[PDB]
Symmetry: D2
Subunit: 239 residues, 4 copies
Amino acid sequence: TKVAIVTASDSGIGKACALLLAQNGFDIGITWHSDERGAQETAKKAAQFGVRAETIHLDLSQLPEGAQAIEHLIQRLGRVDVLVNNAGAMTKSAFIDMPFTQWRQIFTVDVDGAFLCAQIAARHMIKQGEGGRIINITSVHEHTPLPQASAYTAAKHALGGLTKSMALELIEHHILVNAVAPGAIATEPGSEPSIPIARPGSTHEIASLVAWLCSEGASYTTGQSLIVDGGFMLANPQF
Amino acid sequence: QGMTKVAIVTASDSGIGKACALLLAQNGFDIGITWHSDERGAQETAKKAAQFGVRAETIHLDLSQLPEGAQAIEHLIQRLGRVDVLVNNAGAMTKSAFIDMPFTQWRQIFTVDVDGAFLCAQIAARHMIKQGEGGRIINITSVHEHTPLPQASAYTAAKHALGGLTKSMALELIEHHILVNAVAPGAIATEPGSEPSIPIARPGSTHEIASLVAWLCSEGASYTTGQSLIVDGGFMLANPQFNA
Amino acid sequence: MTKVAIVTASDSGIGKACALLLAQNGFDIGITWHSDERGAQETAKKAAQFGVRAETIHLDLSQLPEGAQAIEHLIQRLGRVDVLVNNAGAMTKSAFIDMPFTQWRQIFTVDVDGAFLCAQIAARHMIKQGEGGRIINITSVHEHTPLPQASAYTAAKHALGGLTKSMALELIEHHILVNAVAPGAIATPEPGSEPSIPIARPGSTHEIASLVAWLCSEGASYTTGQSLIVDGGFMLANPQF
Amino acid sequence: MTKVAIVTASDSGIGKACALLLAQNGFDIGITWHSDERGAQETAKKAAQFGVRAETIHLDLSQLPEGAQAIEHLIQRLGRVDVLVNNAGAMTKSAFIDMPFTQWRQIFTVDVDGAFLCAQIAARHMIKQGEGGRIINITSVHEHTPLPQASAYTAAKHALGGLTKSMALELIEHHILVNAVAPGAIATPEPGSEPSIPIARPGSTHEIASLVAWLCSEGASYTTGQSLIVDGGFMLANPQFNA
């Protein structure tokens, strides 16, 4: 029985990932920043699939200590085979007068935290000796800028580069590392005509790919950023 | 049975095409199989496909003389009665030094590696639009849609071409609920430690491509379109510093 | 030793701007024209006022491979070739679902098949001369992102992008550097005229030619296999723009 | 009117080459150094032979944000800033699995945090001046492809490439153009010495500085938001590259 940990799975993409992985037979670890009740609800529904589901408080704003909750969560579940580094909320702030503390705060939660969590998970995966899967939830803005969100863009890009480096260095341990880059996700047909598919995506349309990356059939996929965006990246000033 | 969807996979007599055809049959698609010269392999794929309780039909496809050779796709569609999935599967790679390559060889490689996929895609998309129920088109390209293969400039350029067409089709067919993506294999075997130049140190299996192609045909992929999804055991990660 | 640059379709637009700026840089110039010979001669007359030799030749890349032989004759006239600029011809739109196969092939013929044959001819001479060379393929932002209703154009630009990387890898041993210049929207004969582009205007032909000329310069000797995008921010604008 | 170029870490290597070439192109030059005040002063003396002003200042990008004030004092001495070249410090290697957090942070501090604070200051002056400007971020091929045993370096270079795109979009209305120049292997004081690279040698610092100088020139007025890779074909070599 394998174990999947999904950060920030009290809601949104994280919750959909945790629920689908439970459906697929993984014991589940759920982390929460502020909303323990949402984490409890996800745990309950995850456990309804006949699976163990454990929750822990994780606040990646005070580092490195804040990341130790991943170590406690792994110890409660006995092992870890999957880590989904799920992205927190997006923040807008003009580049020209952004305070350095805000710049650092955004990097702390959006890439520093993922780095520390991945280290902890990858260490256990190496010792277990049975490989593993690490999925970094990034964004289209790993590849293309979000207006008025320069720190968010830069940190998503950083996490994209970290994904590549982790995949290269951990492949010898059969740990495959990929990013899933969502476009606009609603958290109805024709609601966003700026996007070629003309609607936002569902959390399921992201979780379904995350689940595939955890499946036996993904055993040759590593180092990639898989963009799930309804054609967002194809729309240029011409479209 | 009125709800049964049809997948057509070109060159599914063997290799990656065969793996896609059989997995899609196992997942519940009636299957169209095309073959260039290995008819018995095509008959063996149809045999196994039908053990999953679906229809399987085969047809000879000779993409060497275009546009006429692509009509076999229209005949296969007619036999199956509809098409919901097309997998434009990649023929064999060809090598030739750039400085000396005959024009005939340049044109021959483009003929099989992007002109055919263009024509097959048109035919399938016309049926998908008329059917009015959407569809999925997967173009099997290669890591060389993105990075060059030495001594294979024609092949690289044609894979790049097919990547561009993928993006164009995705944009132009989205209004008909047709999602269009490329799957870009690294080196796939036709084992651990057998390919030291690749980070994962081995070639891929055909199942390791087919599995993603199957996911792209599933309900969960309804928001994925216009992308090149690379399955290469880390091939794209390996640069000059991968040494030592 | 006076170096030679050949620029296809330099009777007008970007090709003319590259030919004239390379002329000012001290290259002898080869100029090809499809139908406007007087425009080509006008380019040659202006290039020659910079004190270099300029030569014109008809080039029709629609009938291949014979059509590309004009490049060989231009080189024989000029005595050598050091720079080839494969310039981009006109863009044509055609719906993907309806596009006839002959139109598909026609567009690939002029937009990548012709560049391939010209590049071969120039590279053969650069190899034999033994003094390296530079080949610049003018592509487009649509080497990288689709142009709606122009699937053939987009596919061919992508193809020329791949050829560029392939040529650069195989010709590096002869010190031949191969790159693409990928323009966005370029005006041919002002601020705020194109609000959908972050710069809010189309580019000038000079703003493309300037980089082509840098790519032919001594300082560019470590740059090969790349697609340099000159687009006023075009690639940055997504539905969030 | 005399324009001003500020190049960080121009006491040596790529930064020094950029400073000297911009001095030849007529920019008054601002030079920063981390420890080698002497390389900096030799850079200034040679820049001054081109008839321009050269000012040197210590820049401690390791302890921020206060260290970035050194850029304000430089702009004060030179009177304005028209070009900023964000030039990278030294590369540090460390395995991802056990890389200390302090080292992850130090690498980000010098590879993107300093560039971010310096670009902010430079941009505020370019807006105040009202005559546009050019900001060049020196990244790396590693902005695009990983460097083994250098995950923090790779991540931080990716971050600086993303910041580059965001700044280009956000500053375009002020006619401030922002690009990255992404060098491959660059030599510091020969053909065939790097066979893993298709060109089979490292690059010269002048082969980077030349593109940086073009990006500051009149003809580069339509180029923004891009990452211009100068790498001798590094990006073309994959597992199938040989010999």
